[PDB]
Amino acid sequence: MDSNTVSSFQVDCFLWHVRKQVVDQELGDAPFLDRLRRDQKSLRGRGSTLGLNIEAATHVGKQIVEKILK
Amino acid sequence: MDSNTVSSFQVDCFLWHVRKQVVDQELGDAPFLDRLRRDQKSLRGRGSTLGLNIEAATHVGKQIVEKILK
């Protein structure tokens, strides 16, 4: 497992969480919702394959993105 | 143009900008880079179709996401 495969997954988990909040705020259109559903399935499969816990990865992804937004 | 189609595009523009910064920080793997390239093409087409300026939309997307991260 390369370091970058791990950081890529972490980021994608956190961005998925942000997109889910946009949908819970009723700001997403139909195709945005469809991408959210498809990506959740994809992320779970990648998480299974890598053996990475999704909640843990989501939290590291948040830290990576906060570092970047600074 | 529905309100939600606009907020969905704004969010997607800003998240694309975040993903681009992850790649500039050398944190992305090959498939992460491939999704970045594919999505840039898709976003430009959606921006053209809607008549929305991508830089403007990116900045509103940032505000939407900051509201959510609070």
Curated annotation (Swiss-Prot), chains A, B:
Motif Nuclear localization signal, chain ranges: 34-38
Protein encoded by which gene: NS
Signal sequence segment: none
Family of the protein in this entry: Belongs to the influenza A viruses NS1 family.
This protein's name: Non-structural protein 1
Membrane-crossing segments per the record: none
Species this chain originates from: Influenza A virus (strain A/Udorn/307/1972 H3N2)
Portion of the full-length sequence here: 1 to 70 of 237
Compartment annotation: Host nucleus; Host cytoplasm
Superkingdom field: Viruses
Post-translational modification: Upon interferon induction, ISGylated via host HERC5; this results in the impairment of NS1 interaction with RNA targets due to its inability to form homodimers and to interact with host EIF2AK2/PKR.
Coiled-coil residues: none
Protein function: Inhibits post-transcriptional processing of cellular pre-mRNA, by binding and inhibiting two cellular proteins that are required for the 3'-end processing of cellular pre-mRNAs: the 30 kDa cleavage and polyadenylation specificity factor/CPSF4 and the poly(A)-binding protein 2/PABPN1. In turn, unprocessed 3' end pre-mRNAs accumulate in the host nucleus and are no longer exported to the cytoplasm. Cellular protein synthesis is thereby shut off very early after virus infection.
Domain remark text: The dsRNA-binding region is required for suppression of RNA silencing.
Motif (Nuclear localization signal 1): 34-38
